[PDB]
Amino acid sequence: IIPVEEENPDFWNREAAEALGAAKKLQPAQTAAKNLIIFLGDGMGVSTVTAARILKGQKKDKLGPEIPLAMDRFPYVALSKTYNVDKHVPDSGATATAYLCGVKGNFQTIGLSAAARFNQCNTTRGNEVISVMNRAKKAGKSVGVVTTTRVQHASPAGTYAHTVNRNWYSDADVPASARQEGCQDIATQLISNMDIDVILGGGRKYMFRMGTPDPEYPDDYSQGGTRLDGKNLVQEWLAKRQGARYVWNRTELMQASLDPSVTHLMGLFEPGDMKYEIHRDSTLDPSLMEMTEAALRLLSRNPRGFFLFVEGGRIDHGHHESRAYRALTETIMFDDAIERAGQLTSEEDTLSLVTADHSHVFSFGGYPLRGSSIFGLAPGKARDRKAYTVLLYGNGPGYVLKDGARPDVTESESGSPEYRQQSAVPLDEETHAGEDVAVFARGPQAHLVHGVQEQTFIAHVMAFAACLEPYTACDLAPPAG
Amino acid sequence: IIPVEEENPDFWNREAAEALGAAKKLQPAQTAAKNLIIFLGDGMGVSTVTAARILKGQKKDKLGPEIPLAMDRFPYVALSKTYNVDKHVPDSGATATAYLCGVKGNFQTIGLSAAARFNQCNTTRGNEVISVMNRAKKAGKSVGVVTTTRVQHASPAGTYAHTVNRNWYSDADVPASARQEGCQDIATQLISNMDIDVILGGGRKYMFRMGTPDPEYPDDYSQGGTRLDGKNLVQEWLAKRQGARYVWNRTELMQASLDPSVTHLMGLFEPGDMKYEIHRDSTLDPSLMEMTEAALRLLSRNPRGFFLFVEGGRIDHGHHESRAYRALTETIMFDDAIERAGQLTSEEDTLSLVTADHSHVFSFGGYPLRGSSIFGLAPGKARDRKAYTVLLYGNGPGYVLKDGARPDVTESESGSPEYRQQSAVPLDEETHAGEDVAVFARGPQAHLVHGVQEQTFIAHVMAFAACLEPYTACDLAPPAG
Ligand SMILES: *[C@@H]1O[C@H](CO)[C@@H](O[C@@H]2O[C@H](CO)[C@@H](O)[C@H](O)[C@H]2NC(C)=O)[C@H](O)[C@H]1NC(C)=O
Ligand SMILES: *[C@@H]1O[C@H](CO)[C@@H](O[C@@H]2O[C@H](CO)[C@@H](O)[C@H](O)[C@H]2NC(C)=O)[C@H](O)[C@H]1NC(C)=O
Ligand SMILES: *[C@@H]1O[C@H](CO)[C@@H](O[C@@H]2O[C@H](CO)[C@@H](O)[C@H](O)[C@H]2NC(C)=O)[C@H](O)[C@H]1NC(C)=O
Ligand SMILES: *[C@@H]1O[C@H](CO)[C@@H](O[C@@H]2O[C@H](CO)[C@@H](O)[C@H](O)[C@H]2NC(C)=O)[C@H](O)[C@H]1NC(C)=O
Ligand SMILES: O=[N+]([O-])c1ccc(O)cc1
Ligand SMILES: O=[N+]([O-])c1ccc(O)cc1
Ligand SMILES: O=[N+]([O-])c1ccc(O)cc1
Ligand SMILES: O=[N+]([O-])c1ccc(O)cc1
Ligand SMILES: O=[N+]([O-])c1ccc(O)cc1
Ligand SMILES: O=[N+]([O-])c1ccc(O)cc1
Ligand SMILES: [Ca+2]
Ligand SMILES: [Ca+2]
Ligand code: NA
Numbered sequence: 011i012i013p014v015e016e017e018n019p020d021f022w023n024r025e026a027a028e029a030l031g032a033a034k035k036l037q038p039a040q041t042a043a044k045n046l047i048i049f050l051g052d053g054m055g056v057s058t059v060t061a062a063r064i065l066k067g068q069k070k071d072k073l074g075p076e077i078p079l080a081m082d083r084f085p086y087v088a089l090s091k092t093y094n095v096d097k098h099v100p101d102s103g104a105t106a107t108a109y110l111c112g113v114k115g116n117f118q119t120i121g122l123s124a125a126a127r128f129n130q131c132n133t134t135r136g137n138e139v140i141s142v143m144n145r146a147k148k149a150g151k152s153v154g155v156v157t158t159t160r161v162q163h164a165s166p167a168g169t170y171a172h173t174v175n176r177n178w179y180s181d182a183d184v185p186a187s188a189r190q191e192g193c194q195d196i197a198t199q200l201i202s203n204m205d206i207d208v209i210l211g212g213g214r215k216y217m218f219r220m221g222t223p224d225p226e227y228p229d230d231y232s233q234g235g236t237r238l239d240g241k242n243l244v245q246e247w248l249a250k251r252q253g254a255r256y257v258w259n260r261t262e263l264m265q266a267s268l269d270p271s272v273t274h275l276m277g278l279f280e281p282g283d284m285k286y287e288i289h290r291d292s293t294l295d296p297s298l299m300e301m302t303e304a305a306l307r308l309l310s311r312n313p314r315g316f317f318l319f320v321e322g323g324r325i326d327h328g329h330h331e332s333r334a335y336r337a338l339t340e341t342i343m344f345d346d347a348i349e350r351a352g353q354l355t356s357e358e359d360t361l362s363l364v365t366a367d368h369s370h371v372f373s374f375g376g377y378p379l380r381g382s383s384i385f386g387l388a389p390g391k392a393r394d395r396k397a398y399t400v401l402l403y404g405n406g407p408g409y410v411l412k413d414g415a416r417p418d419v420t421e422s423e424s425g426s427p428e429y430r431q432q433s434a435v436p437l438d439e440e441t442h443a444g445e446d447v448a449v450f451a452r453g454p455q456a457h458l459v460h461g462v463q464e465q466t467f468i469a470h471v472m473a474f475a476a477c478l479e480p481y482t483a484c485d486l487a488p489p490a491g
Numbered sequence: 492i493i494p495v496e497e498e499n500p501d502f503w504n505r506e507a508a509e510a511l512g513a514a515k516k517l518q519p520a521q522t523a524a525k526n527l528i529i530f531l532g533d534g535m536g537v538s539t540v541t542a543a544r545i546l547k548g549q550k551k552d553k554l555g556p557e558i559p560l561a562m563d564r565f566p567y568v569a570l571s572k573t574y575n576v577d578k579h580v581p582d583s584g585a586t587a588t589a590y591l592c593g594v595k596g597n598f599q600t601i602g603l604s605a606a607a608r609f610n611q612c613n614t615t616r617g618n619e620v621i622s623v624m625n626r627a628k629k630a631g632k633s634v635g636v637v638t639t640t641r642v643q644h645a646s647p648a649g650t651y652a653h654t655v656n657r658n659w660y661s662d663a664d665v666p667a668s669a670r671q672e673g674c675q676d677i678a679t680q681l682i683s684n685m686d687i688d689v690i691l692g693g694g695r696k697y698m699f700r701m702g703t704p705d706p707e708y709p710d711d712y713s714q715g716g717t718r719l720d721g722k723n724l725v726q727e728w729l730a731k732r733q734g735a736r737y738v739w740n741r742t743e744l745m746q747a748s749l750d751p752s753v754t755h756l757m758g759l760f761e762p763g764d765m766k767y768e769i770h771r772d773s774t775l776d777p778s779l780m781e782m783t784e785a786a787l788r789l790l791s792r793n794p795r796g797f798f799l800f801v802e803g804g805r806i807d808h809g810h811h812e813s814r815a816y817r818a819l820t821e822t823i824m825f826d827d828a829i830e831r832a833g834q835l836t837s838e839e840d841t842l843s844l845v846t847a848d849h850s851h852v853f854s855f856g857g858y859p860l861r862g863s864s865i866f867g868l869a870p871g872k873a874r875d876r877k878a879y880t881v882l883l884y885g886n887g888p889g890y891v892l893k894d895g896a897r898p899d900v901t902e903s904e905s906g907s908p909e910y911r912q913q914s915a916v917p918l919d920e921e922t923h924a925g926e927d928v929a930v931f932a933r934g935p936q937a938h939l940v941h942g943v944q945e946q947t948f949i950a951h952v953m954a955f956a957a958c959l960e961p962y963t964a965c966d967l968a969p970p971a972g
């Protein structure tokens with residue numbers, strides 16, 4: 011459908027004149043960031059952003075592509091080069107090292123320079139690289155990690171952990187030789203490496219000994235504690251800190267976030283990853299936006315400021331399943347969390363970056379009409395006289411042959427939350443993609459986010475803006491009020 | 492392969508410190524642009540840029556992803572929203588209207604507001620929108636159109652034409668009713684609508700009457716003149732301008748570009764589109780870079796400045812064939828042309844923008860090792876135990892079944908210049924994609940290119956920077972020396 015207002019060139023000329031006016035008003039801050047926030051859309055590449063924009067636009071009864079996402083409103087954009095040192099198409103662990111520690115790493119390691127080697131515990135020591143979050147804590151800021159995945163998953167683990175193997179969630183995962191060599195599982199590192207004021211997301215099971223019933227699924231043994239070392243890491247964490255609280259559901263999270271006596275908060279809301287937003291039990295589980303707000307309630311108390319990591323962690327997972335419906339609905343909630351954080355913080359003193367760790371082989375094609383559903387069929391048949399979808403994957407589990415041929419697809423089928431878009435190459439999981447991802451920035455020193463940069467730039471600009479090591483001589487004035 | 496220097500965190504910290512230093516040195520100009528250049532990579536989306544970067548990096552005996560393209564060096568980046576008014580995934584005609592005229596249009600029209608309708612001649616008048624190039628000419632600047640496609644193709648036609656049908660290359664293409672209604676073919680518009688100082692690219696055949704042997708292929712009738720109205724548009728164009736020259740080969744182009752008496756130059760080097768760079772006869776045909784330099788030789792003579800359109804027009808065509816080798820080699824030549832123009836002009840007085848009209852359903856995935864060929868196989872087999880490539884398409888003519896199954900692929904096969912990467916959906920031509928594309932900018936007012944913008948912003952910022960209508964009250968100082 012052609013929106014009538016857009017048929018008039020004045021519509022476009024007025025918009026562009028407004029855009030030019032806004033562009034001219036942008037001025038660099040001479041002042042430091044008090045607070046730092048990184049919003050990480052796991053797998054949220056450029057095709058994901060545009061597709062999610064269209065879906066969100068239509069969610070609010072618009073045509074789609076013309077309505078800005080909250081992230082679209084950020085004044086400064088750069089492209090981020092995501093390659094790992096050893097692989098062109100990266101993973102979440104080693105990208106986390108880049109955007110959180112400022113150093114590129116090898117595929118599937120976390121918080122380590124590329125002198126380390128995947129799954130080789132004895133290459134760990136000397137190669138630890140300290141995150142901006144760690145440095146923020148050292149400078150007396152409060153720090154928070156918020157994600158829809160396990161809090162021990164690769165991305166949040168980049169804020170605190172150093173490991174040659176992202177798969178080492180608990181001691182149960184670590185081979186005997188590595189345990190002997192002192193490579194700690196990620197759950198242990200979470201509570202041991204540094205003080206973290208707010209930890210919210212999934213990953214209950216890795217904190218408790220085998221045999222410990224999950225409080226939410228006490229009748230499902232597979233959801234229970236995983237630990238073989240008898241440790242209760244939650245009790246250990248609580249024992250270290252006066253004013254610490256542990257919660258596992260939304261109601262207790264709410265109570266904790268408003269409780270003045272709570273100085274440290276760990277909320278682990280599922281045994282593993284949190285449910286997709288479309289599957290979330292809104293009585294039992296907080297959304298990413300709600301967790302973001304809860305984190306901000308506590309972190310904002312510190313007069314020295316805070317560093318906050320917020321991850322739309324299951325965007326990635328949706329794409330891996332080649333279920334664009336899941337990827338894009340996760341992306342919208344991620345954008346909602348960005349929007350919410352923007353309402354609760356000031357760009358006068360808070361540097362916010364939105365980025366992705368890497369992309370996916372997700373494409374948005376065919377020649378669909380303005381206003382058509384992103385989950386719809388491309389107009390016109392394929393060469394095999396069957397329909398095809400506007401959303402497709404290069405590879406992944408949506409590749410199908412029924413009776414020796416590519417299957418036809420209907421609108422009702424293509425629009426289902428369980429539908430897997432077709433791909434060229436069958437894989438159990440669709441792959442990451444290696445093309446550049448966007449970095450969006452707002453706040454003090456955000457104007458430094460520009461051009462095409464190595465992904466490591468994200469960590470460095472954040473440390474610089476807050477005058478953290480190695481940029482204590484930042485020569486910036488104190489944060490603005 | 493893991494490059495040893497990158498194993499040291501100091502490598503990444505030094506690079507980022509340098510990047511921060513460079514970012515801090517950026518300052519906005521208070522002065523206007525004397526010259527304007529738009530480099531348009533047709534179909535050159537973010538996945539194309541990254542893949543081309545890797546290929547070019549390796550061309551210069553590097554590992555790939557770490558080596559900047561010339562476009563990567565531009566300080567200012569924005570994302571450009573490419574939707575047409577009527578379709579989410581756009582074509583070249585209506586995107587051309589956006590980035591060259593500053594107004595969005597309907598799919599397959601050129602230089603017209605979205606009040607016009609495709610292939611409806613009687614909806615043309617009143618809906619013409621004037622290009623920045625036209626306005627530059629009106630302001631006394633010299634103007635040039637350079638492309639590897641037909642000069643009557645959708646993208647260059649956006650600089651000068653207004654038509655409800657991009658397919659109307661010559662009068663032979665225009666239906667009787669539209670001819671009667673005065674909708675002129677694009678070849679006629681090229682010579683009639685405005686004075687253009689330099690016109691270089693393909694499209695000889697549309698300028699000459701049926702029966703006219705092509706000078707380069709005098710024995711191939713299909714390459715001969717197409718016109719049914721008896722007009723020789725080249726003679727007509729020459730007759731209008733003292734100091735005008737027409738050339739059809741590289742040798743004459745060279746002579747013309749150095750000839751002080753040549754004020755107007757039309758070089759039409761193939762009957763239709765120019766050959767792919769990998770097929771170019773370097774005695775008979777200039778490369779895009781060579782055409783760019785030839786245009787700059789003449790355009791730079793005008794003390795008032797110039798507007799130059801330079802198109803990597805066959806990037807798009809490579810992707811349509813699902814032959815990434817062609818798409819990416821075209822992209823590298825496009826980047827070479829950008830680099831060359833940067834050597835021949837000053838960023839003190841020249842605003843250069845590099846962008847794409849839209850993207851393609853091209854993806855770069857699997858988990859290939861650092862330094863591996865972009866045309867290689869992904870490590871590890873697909874679920875069907877056969878190999879697959881790191882480059883894939885969502886749809887297009889690379890979809891194959893041999894004996895009822897997806898074919899295996901070898902490195903020798905995947906690396907061939909004729910190889911079509913596999914897709915999910917068979918189509919005679921792979922489709923454009925609708926995700927945002929990059930805009931790179933350098934020069935006076937380039938800092939205004941920021942954030943996420945409608946594609947129309949590209950035209951507007953260019954007009955503004957040069958103080959052209961509608962921005963004659965730009966309030967900028969005269970261009971810098
Ligand atoms: C990490 O430990 C591994 C495993 O013991 C070491 O690999 C051995 O190295 C020796 C000498 O090069 C070889 O002869 C063995 O075959 C290797 N063993 C295995 C099982 O791979 C490795 O040298 C250690 N690395 C460091 C940095 O100490
Ligand atoms: C959220 O978690 C809290 C804390 O564990 C749960 O509160 C317990 O509820 C059980 C069953 O009603 C009671 O026996 C205990 O008195 C409560 N413990 C505490 C420390 O308050 C609460 O049930 C959970 N909410 C939901 C919906 O499951
Ligand atoms: C452009 O010309 C077309 C073709 O003549 C016009 O379409 C006709 O419109 C009348 C009245 O609405 C219909 O009854 C006919 O069936 C149409 N003819 C065809 C062949 O489509 C159209 O109205 C014209 N548009 C303008 C702006 O004048
Ligand atoms: C490039 O074009 C020029 C101009 O048309 C060609 O020059 C002509 O060559 C023919 C054949 O040798 C001569 O009969 C004419 O004297 C030339 N015409 C002019 C006006 O110079 C030239 O041959 C072309 N080059 C190539 C390699 O084909
Ligand atoms: O970390 N990752 O995304 C991975 C891990 C293993 C693998 O085979 C491919 C990708
Ligand atoms: O022994 N276990 O792992 C158990 C025991 C009881 C229960 O409700 C859940 C798990
Ligand atoms: O815990 N929190 O801060 C919350 C919880 C729920 C909600 O809707 C908003 C904020
Ligand atoms: O202009 N285009 O890119 C087109 C034209 C026709 C079509 O069916 C699809 C795409
Ligand atoms: O009549 N024709 O179209 C012709 C005639 C002669 C020739 O060499 C080429 C084309
Ligand atoms: O015509 N030109 O300006 C040229 C032609 C060829 C070349 O290699 C460089 C410039
Ligand atoms: Ca739960
Ligand atoms: Ca030729
Ligand atoms: Na393992």
Ligand code: NA
Nearest residue numbers: 610656658664
């Ligand atoms: Na036609």
Ligand SMILES: [Zn+2]
Nearest residue numbers: 052053102367
């Ligand atoms: Zn990831």
Ligand SMILES: [Zn+2]
Nearest residue numbers: 052102165323
């Ligand atoms: Zn993640």
Ligand SMILES: [Zn+2]
Nearest residue numbers: 053326330442
């Ligand atoms: Zn992933």
Ligand SMILES: [Zn+2]
Nearest residue numbers: 533534583848
């Ligand atoms: Zn195009």
Ligand SMILES: [Zn+2]
Nearest residue numbers: 533583646804
């Ligand atoms: Zn084009």
Ligand SMILES: [Zn+2]
Nearest residue numbers: 534807811923
């Ligand atoms: Zn195209």
